Design a protein around this ligand. Sequence first.
Ligand SMILES: [Ca+2]
Ligand SMILES: [Ca+2]
Ligand SMILES: [Ca+2]
Ligand SMILES: [Ca+2]
Ligand SMILES: [Ca+2]
Ligand SMILES: [Zn+2]
Length: 316
Amino acid sequence: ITGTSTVGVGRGVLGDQKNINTTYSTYYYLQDNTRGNGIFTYDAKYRTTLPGSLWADADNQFFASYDAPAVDAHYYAGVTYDYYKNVHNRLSYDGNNAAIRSSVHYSQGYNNAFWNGSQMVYGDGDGQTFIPLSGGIDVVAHELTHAVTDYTAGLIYQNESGAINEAISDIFGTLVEFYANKNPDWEIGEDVYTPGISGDSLRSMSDPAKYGDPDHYSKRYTGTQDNGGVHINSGIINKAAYLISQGGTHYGVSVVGIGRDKLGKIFYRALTQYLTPTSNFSQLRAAAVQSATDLYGSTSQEVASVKQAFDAVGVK
Ligand SMILES: [Ca+2]
Ligand SMILES: [Ca+2]
Ligand SMILES: [Ca+2]
Ligand SMILES: [Ca+2]
Ligand SMILES: [Ca+2]
Ligand SMILES: [Zn+2]
């Protein structure tokens, strides 16, 4: 990890070639010195001990199929870092250029990725439900957005707070996907979910109900599974964010879209200035309204659209 900065080349999960920032010191390591205090990618070697070994490669070429998840975790973490820096003027997830660490090849057949409070972790999937999860830029950015949330609002991962936490990760995962401008959509995980099946995804922001997730507060899940429905009730907020950006009429309520850039600015402000660990949906609405008010004025279209969107999904 002390060495010379260089640039290697490899192929990612989906077979695309990309340049990656590496560090040379006997081996070439997946250590990007160009961004903050660095982006580091580790090999968990099919175990669950973390972080594993800093990824070392003999020739700075990453075309082996074992390499692909590392390439994409390393690259997409850099893209995510760039999004936050360039769009929101935020230096890494803590605002002080904290090193970003990811481990790939976690466990065997593991159909998930997560932020664990210290680092990102990516399974390879079982090859049927998922292919390696770092192949999805929205997934990567979703996970690194959990780190942002943890250092800012600190939304507890349960019940309504947790659903907001999840939605924020989907929202910013999608915004990063649009920033990178590679096949962007309002779906989550499409690139890595069900390689056998075209056109599906893990979750939809444009139509959460496509996969049985609620799109109105009246349909919220009230039981105990999934920490009180954090991945289920996120759909209510996701739909609201989609409406703020894109517009539409939902349960008879019409929303004029204000676009993705303003969506991002409003929700970033809400997250960093107004939300707290125990914020519920009604407080999110208030925070988003206040944020839009701060940015655009109390009689703006932007404020009106935020109100309309939350009315559309039944959040007062
Ligand atoms: Ca190599
Ligand atoms: Ca091997
Ligand atoms: Ca996409
Ligand atoms: Ca997507
Ligand atoms: Ca699929
Ligand atoms: Zn999440």
